[PDB]
Design an enzyme around this catalytic site. Sequence first.
Site, PDB file in Angstrom:
ATOM      1  N   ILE C 168      36.166  40.712  50.422  1.00 51.05           N
ATOM      2  CA  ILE C 168      36.281  41.435  49.159  1.00 51.05           C
ATOM      3  C   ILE C 168      36.051  40.525  47.954  1.00 51.05           C
ATOM      4  O   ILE C 168      35.124  40.757  47.163  1.00 51.05           O
ATOM      5  CB  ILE C 168      37.649  42.105  48.996  1.00 51.05           C
ATOM      6  CG1 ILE C 168      37.825  43.235  50.011  1.00 51.05           C
ATOM      7  CG2 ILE C 168      37.798  42.654  47.581  1.00 51.05           C
ATOM      8  CD1 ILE C 168      39.232  43.819  50.013  1.00 51.05           C
ATOM      9  N   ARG C 170      35.886  36.454  46.770  1.00 49.30           N
ATOM     10  CA  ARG C 170      35.914  34.988  46.766  1.00 49.30           C
ATOM     11  C   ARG C 170      36.637  34.448  45.522  1.00 49.30           C
ATOM     12  O   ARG C 170      36.786  35.144  44.518  1.00 49.30           O
ATOM     13  CB  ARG C 170      34.488  34.390  46.829  1.00 49.30           C
ATOM     14  CG  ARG C 170      33.822  34.387  48.225  1.00 49.30           C
ATOM     15  CD  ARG C 170      32.938  33.136  48.483  1.00 49.30           C
ATOM     16  NE  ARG C 170      31.610  33.197  47.859  1.00 49.30           N
ATOM     17  CZ  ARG C 170      30.650  32.274  48.005  1.00 49.30           C
ATOM     18  NH1 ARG C 170      30.847  31.192  48.757  1.00 49.30           N
ATOM     19  NH2 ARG C 170      29.474  32.429  47.397  1.00 49.30           N
ATOM     20  N   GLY C 172      38.068  30.174  43.850  1.00 43.37           N
ATOM     21  CA  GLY C 172      37.828  28.726  43.841  1.00 43.37           C
ATOM     22  C   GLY C 172      38.206  28.039  45.145  1.00 43.37           C
ATOM     23  O   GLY C 172      37.385  27.344  45.750  1.00 43.37           O
ATOM     24  N   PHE C 173      39.450  28.235  45.577  1.00 38.82           N
ATOM     25  CA  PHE C 173      39.949  27.623  46.812  1.00 38.82           C
ATOM     26  C   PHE C 173      39.554  28.409  48.063  1.00 38.82           C
ATOM     27  O   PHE C 173      39.270  27.813  49.103  1.00 38.82           O
ATOM     28  CB  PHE C 173      41.479  27.475  46.785  1.00 38.82           C
ATOM     29  CG  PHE C 173      42.014  26.726  45.585  1.00 38.82           C
ATOM     30  CD1 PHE C 173      41.298  25.670  45.004  1.00 38.82           C
ATOM     31  CD2 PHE C 173      43.266  27.062  45.058  1.00 38.82           C
ATOM     32  CE1 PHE C 173      41.810  24.983  43.901  1.00 38.82           C
ATOM     33  CE2 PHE C 173      43.790  26.382  43.957  1.00 38.82           C
ATOM     34  CZ  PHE C 173      43.062  25.339  43.376  1.00 38.82           C
ATOM     35  N   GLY C 174      39.552  29.736  47.973  1.00 36.39           N
ATOM     36  CA  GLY C 174      39.254  30.567  49.134  1.00 36.39           C
ATOM     37  C   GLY C 174      38.802  31.975  48.797  1.00 36.39           C
ATOM     38  O   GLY C 174      38.017  32.167  47.870  1.00 36.39           O
ATOM     39  N   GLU C 175      39.303  32.956  49.551  1.00 33.84           N
ATOM     40  CA  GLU C 175      38.765  34.320  49.511  1.00 33.84           C
ATOM     41  C   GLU C 175      39.724  35.418  50.006  1.00 33.84           C
ATOM     42  O   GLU C 175      40.769  35.130  50.595  1.00 33.84           O
ATOM     43  CB  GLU C 175      37.458  34.379  50.313  1.00 33.84           C
ATOM     44  CG  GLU C 175      37.475  33.592  51.624  1.00 33.84           C
ATOM     45  CD  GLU C 175      36.986  32.155  51.473  1.00 33.84           C
ATOM     46  OE1 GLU C 175      37.732  31.236  51.881  1.00 33.84           O
ATOM     47  OE2 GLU C 175      35.864  31.949  50.946  1.00 33.84           O
ATOM     48  N   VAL C 176      39.344  36.673  49.760  1.00 34.81           N
ATOM     49  CA  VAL C 176      40.127  37.846  50.152  1.00 34.81           C
ATOM     50  C   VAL C 176      39.341  38.686  51.160  1.00 34.81           C
ATOM     51  O   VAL C 176      38.133  38.844  51.028  1.00 34.81           O
ATOM     52  CB  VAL C 176      40.480  38.720  48.919  1.00 34.81           C
ATOM     53  CG1 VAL C 176      41.386  39.873  49.316  1.00 34.81           C
ATOM     54  CG2 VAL C 176      41.140  37.882  47.826  1.00 34.81           C
ATOM     55  N   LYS C 191      44.540  37.341  51.642  1.00 32.82           N
ATOM     56  CA  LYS C 191      44.037  36.290  50.767  1.00 32.82           C
ATOM     57  C   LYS C 191      44.260  34.966  51.475  1.00 32.82           C
ATOM     58  O   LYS C 191      45.404  34.605  51.757  1.00 32.82           O
ATOM     59  CB  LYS C 191      44.775  36.305  49.420  1.00 32.82           C
ATOM     60  CG  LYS C 191      44.283  35.283  48.382  1.00 32.82           C
ATOM     61  CD  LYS C 191      44.885  35.539  46.978  1.00 32.82           C
ATOM     62  CE  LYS C 191      44.379  34.504  45.953  1.00 32.82           C
ATOM     63  NZ  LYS C 191      44.714  34.817  44.524  1.00 32.82           N
ATOM     64  N   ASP C 288      47.519  35.647  32.206  1.00 37.13           N
ATOM     65  CA  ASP C 288      46.056  35.706  32.372  1.00 37.13           C
ATOM     66  C   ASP C 288      45.578  37.171  32.413  1.00 37.13           C
ATOM     67  O   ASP C 288      44.619  37.510  33.113  1.00 37.13           O
ATOM     68  CB  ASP C 288      45.650  34.933  33.643  1.00 37.13           C
ATOM     69  CG  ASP C 288      44.187  34.489  33.639  1.00 37.13           C
ATOM     70  OD1 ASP C 288      43.681  33.999  32.593  1.00 37.13           O
ATOM     71  OD2 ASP C 288      43.548  34.612  34.710  1.00 37.13           O
TER      72      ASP C 288
HETATM   73  C1  LIG Z   1      40.592  39.951  43.569  1.00 38.88           C
HETATM   74  N1  LIG Z   1      41.761  39.209  44.092  1.00 38.88           N
HETATM   75  C2  LIG Z   1      42.095  37.983  43.731  1.00 38.88           C
HETATM   76  C3  LIG Z   1      41.365  37.087  42.722  1.00 38.88           C
HETATM   77  N2  LIG Z   1      41.831  35.690  42.820  1.00 38.88           N
HETATM   78  C4  LIG Z   1      41.534  34.867  43.839  1.00 38.88           C
HETATM   79  C5  LIG Z   1      40.863  35.291  44.993  1.00 38.88           C
HETATM   80  C6  LIG Z   1      40.584  34.381  46.019  1.00 38.88           C
HETATM   81  C7  LIG Z   1      40.975  33.044  45.898  1.00 38.88           C
HETATM   82  C8  LIG Z   1      41.649  32.623  44.755  1.00 38.88           C
HETATM   83  C9  LIG Z   1      42.092  31.167  44.573  1.00 38.88           C
HETATM   84  O1  LIG Z   1      41.442  30.251  45.075  1.00 38.88           O
HETATM   85  N3  LIG Z   1      43.190  31.010  43.812  1.00 38.88           N
HETATM   86  C10 LIG Z   1      43.758  29.713  43.407  1.00 38.88           C
HETATM   87  C11 LIG Z   1      42.995  29.277  42.138  1.00 38.88           C
HETATM   88  C12 LIG Z   1      41.780  28.626  42.378  1.00 38.88           C
HETATM   89  C13 LIG Z   1      40.952  28.172  41.352  1.00 38.88           C
HETATM   90  C14 LIG Z   1      41.332  28.370  40.031  1.00 38.88           C
HETATM   91  C15 LIG Z   1      42.534  29.022  39.762  1.00 38.88           C
HETATM   92  C16 LIG Z   1      43.376  29.479  40.791  1.00 38.88           C
HETATM   93  C17 LIG Z   1      44.688  30.203  40.365  1.00 38.88           C
HETATM   94  F1  LIG Z   1      45.187  29.664  39.234  1.00 38.88           F
HETATM   95  F2  LIG Z   1      44.383  31.493  40.115  1.00 38.88           F
HETATM   96  F3  LIG Z   1      45.625  30.126  41.322  1.00 38.88           F
HETATM   97  C18 LIG Z   1      41.910  33.535  43.733  1.00 38.88           C
HETATM   98  N4  LIG Z   1      43.194  37.683  44.423  1.00 38.88           N
HETATM   99  N5  LIG Z   1      43.505  38.632  45.151  1.00 38.88           N
HETATM  100  C19 LIG Z   1      42.649  39.632  44.992  1.00 38.88           C
HETATM  101  C20 LIG Z   1      42.719  40.850  45.660  1.00 38.88           C
HETATM  102  C21 LIG Z   1      43.939  41.513  45.768  1.00 38.88           C
HETATM  103  C22 LIG Z   1      43.994  42.734  46.454  1.00 38.88           C
HETATM  104  N6  LIG Z   1      42.902  43.271  46.997  1.00 38.88           N
HETATM  105  C23 LIG Z   1      41.719  42.660  46.908  1.00 38.88           C
HETATM  106  C24 LIG Z   1      41.592  41.434  46.242  1.00 38.88           C
END
Ligand SMILES: Cn1c(CNc2cccc(C(=O)NCc3ccccc3C(F)(F)F)c2)nnc1-c1ccncc1
Lengths: 339, 61, 609
Positions: C168, C170, C172-176, C191, C288
């Site tokens: 669904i 992607r 920075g670190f990973g994906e959903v 996630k 955010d």
């Molecule tokens: C759209 N979505 C996101 C968006 N954020 C996300 C997705 C995958 C990986 C990451 C991630 O690597 N998070 C850690 C990170 C990595 C790089 C920069 C900032 C951050 C943060 F500060 F956000 F932790 C974030 N997270 N969960 C969803 C999602 C929730 C429910 N259904 C579908 C998707």
Amino acid sequence: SELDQLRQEAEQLKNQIRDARKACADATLSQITNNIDPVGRIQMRTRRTLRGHLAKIYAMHWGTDSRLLVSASQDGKLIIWDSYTTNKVHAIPLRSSWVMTCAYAPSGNYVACGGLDNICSIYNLKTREGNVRVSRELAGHTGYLSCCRFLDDNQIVTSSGDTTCALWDIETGQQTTTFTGHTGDVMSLSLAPDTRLFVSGACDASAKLWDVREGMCRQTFTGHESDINAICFFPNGNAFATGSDDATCRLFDLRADQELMTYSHDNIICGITSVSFSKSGRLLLAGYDDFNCNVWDALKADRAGVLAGHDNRVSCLGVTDDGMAVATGSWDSFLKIWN
Amino acid sequence: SIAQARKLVEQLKMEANIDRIKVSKAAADLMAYCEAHAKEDPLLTPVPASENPFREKKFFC
Amino acid sequence: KKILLPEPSIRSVMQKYLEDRGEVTFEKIFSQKLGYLLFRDFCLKHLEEAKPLVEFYEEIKKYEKLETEEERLVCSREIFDTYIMKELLACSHPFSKSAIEHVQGHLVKKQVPPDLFQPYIEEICQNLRGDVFQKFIESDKFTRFCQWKNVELNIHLTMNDFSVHRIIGRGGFGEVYGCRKADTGKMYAMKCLDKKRIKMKQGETLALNERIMLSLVSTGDCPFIVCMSYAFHTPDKLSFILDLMNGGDLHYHLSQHGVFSEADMRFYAAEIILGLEHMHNRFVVYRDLKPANILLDEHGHVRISDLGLACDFSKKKPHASVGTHGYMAPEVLQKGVAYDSSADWFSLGCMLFKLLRGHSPFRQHKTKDKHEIDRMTLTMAVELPDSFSPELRSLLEGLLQRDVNRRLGCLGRGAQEVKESPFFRSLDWQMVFLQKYPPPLIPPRGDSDQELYRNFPLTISERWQQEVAETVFDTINAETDRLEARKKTKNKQLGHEEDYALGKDCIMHGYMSKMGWQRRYFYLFPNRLEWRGEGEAPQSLLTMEEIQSVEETQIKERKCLLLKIRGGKQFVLQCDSDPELVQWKKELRDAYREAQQLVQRVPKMKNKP
Ligand SMILES: Cn1c(CNc2cccc(C(=O)NCc3ccccc3C(F)(F)F)c2)nnc1-c1ccncc1
């Protein structure tokens, strides 16, 4: 300070009693018996093993029919055995795990046991409804039940870690007579054949003779150096034997009011756990923490034989009323019947 | 211990009071008793094996 | 790959596990979904004097959820007549005069608020707390509670415990991804992140923050936040198990649909405002809020998403610049100035203005240069087109005041201030919460490092119990009843072992396994541990006296108990679940220590030279 005058008064009486006895000590049993023939080598063997307890056996007692006996175990059960066959007549799982003693009533109608429950529980083995059930829990002692013996179906005598003994009316469930005097935990008791007296042995290193009706200590026998664990009456009712942690047995006479004999050897160093006579009194069988039961010439103090067939403490033994047999119970979990 | 030493005194009063026998008589009777009952003691005087439940007795009631 | 409950004998062990933690109480069991369901089941069918109280209780709870006053006027009278007047006239009414008068006093004046019956809730609980509850504990339904509670406390999630479908989102670190949990079938979003990439970017504290913020937020079953049900790790990844959202983000949809009507922005903002209220009641500033972070479901209802920047402001208040530049507040940008929830209310107004106009109020079409974006925030009062309604105007002017002590949500009472804005005057927020307003957009169908991540695994009791209650709970109850009826009928035709634990002084019992694995049933008593195979009674044991110690050891990646015995001998025990481990360890230690103290007192029982 009033206590001054009473302790010295207790000494002047301590001495008076020693004196009256010292005066009676004109010979020794050993001298008097030095002429009669030795019993010779007694070499009994094991005729039965009783297998079925799961851990240490702590106590046993024969039925007056010289056939059935109860044992009491660390496993939390009484088992009533038929020695002739090895069959189990009853396995009684107890309410308390911590049982230390057990008694078989003369009639055969009941058994008793107790331990750290501080309770003497009477099991009816002839319930109208073909069952075995606790018919009374004699509560009263403030310490652990260390021994008990029925006089009859309605009466029983118990010794306790609270230092006392008592006679109970089983129906009333009360102490009829209490027997205070001992200063250490009481470990054992034996009823006289007439059941008008009984002796006790306690950790104060002394044995007392009691009048059942009067509730008084009549005489008090010392000499032992450590705890008296076991006691029993010589068959005529005029003497009794004791076993102690001091690795000795001793024979005391009531009428002479003192010790007649010590049974020991430099090898035997472990403590005695249990004692009983053969039907005639000539033999005194005693169990040791060294895993053997030694047979003694009660009249000469000779070791006549050893019963060596347990792999842990021999914690209890008994000689049938008919004199045919000796039962030994051990920490190894087996009873053996010897002959 | 006020009371404690008092019953100890009077308990000895009872204990010291009984009239006694010589050991010779005491030992004599024990020795005599044994000797009278020796014949009836199966651990001293063995009985026929066929009457002994723990050796060869076959009928039981 | 299905739920199977332990056997009823697990009660012996589990009840003590719960007693040790104060969990065998009315409040604690009654407020758990499955505990509640099992307790009602007990009262409705097996105890006559409980029936009316629970019946009455559930009628109130139904009453609480009625929307209009006129529906409530009707049902209030039904309840009064059935559970009050009838019982009273039947001498069957165990409630206080004050209770009767409170309701009747209100009913006579046709004042029918949602909480009219609250005093009766309290007194029902009072009437349930005592004997009724104790009778519950005595019954098979508390046994079934223990069987379910065992399963819960034993969850160790892996990837094998799921079924992944399709990607669904992607990051920075990973994906959903989209997944289905085999157990029950509940559809979730998984996630996942990579520790390697995290290690290569040193974002350990970032990944950390999200799990901590998620647990702080994932109780209450909030509709308008992507919440967590589980967290776990494997050697290579971290896994959040989130509420599933298939419909993509508002950033994507804003790009396809274009700017939205006032009517349609109203919908989203409504849902968002309830999301923020939730986080602010739990002392968390999201920080955010932007359209990329709002997600759509299959019907078009929305949820706030990624929590990686969210902050706990209960204890210590944040000062750092954090968020995206076109939505941060003056406070948030300033060097070392504290702020609280106020940050999101600004952000919210920035993002609502985006939905309306296609960009940030403070961005006039630039990119790298956030500096201009920032300085227009701290001086420019935002120009609005005459197109806007004055209802909308005041809302945005409220939300976008630069003084914290002026803006909406900030001085008095948080979300209630915003909800009361004229812009939202047509809304009924009970309906916004129940997700009843029609969405404007229906999305179209077609080694050392690893210790930082200890205490990352997690299960949200309330979440897991909800999943179970809405899937298998009923069928598995009926199934596992049937099994036991068979076993009961079986045992009586095999001369049932009238339980060996009854009427003695057994401390605890249940299954474990040994080597000398060999599975036996164990009974712990004060002075020994007995055990048996099936058929016989126990014909073997260990005494407490010979047990020297009770350490814990690992065997082929599995936790087991190591008992040291007197003779230099050793005994290995394996349990079925973590609570069994913890509880056999404790009770065995308590038992042996306490027995060895006893025996030392008893001269007949102790060892001598
Ligand atoms: C759209 N979505 C996101 C968006 N954020 C996300 C997705 C995958 C990986 C990451 C991630 O690597 N998070 C850690 C990170 C990595 C790089 C920069 C900032 C951050 C943060 F500060 F956000 F932790 C974030 N997270 N969960 C969803 C999602 C929730 C429910 N259904 C579908 C998707």
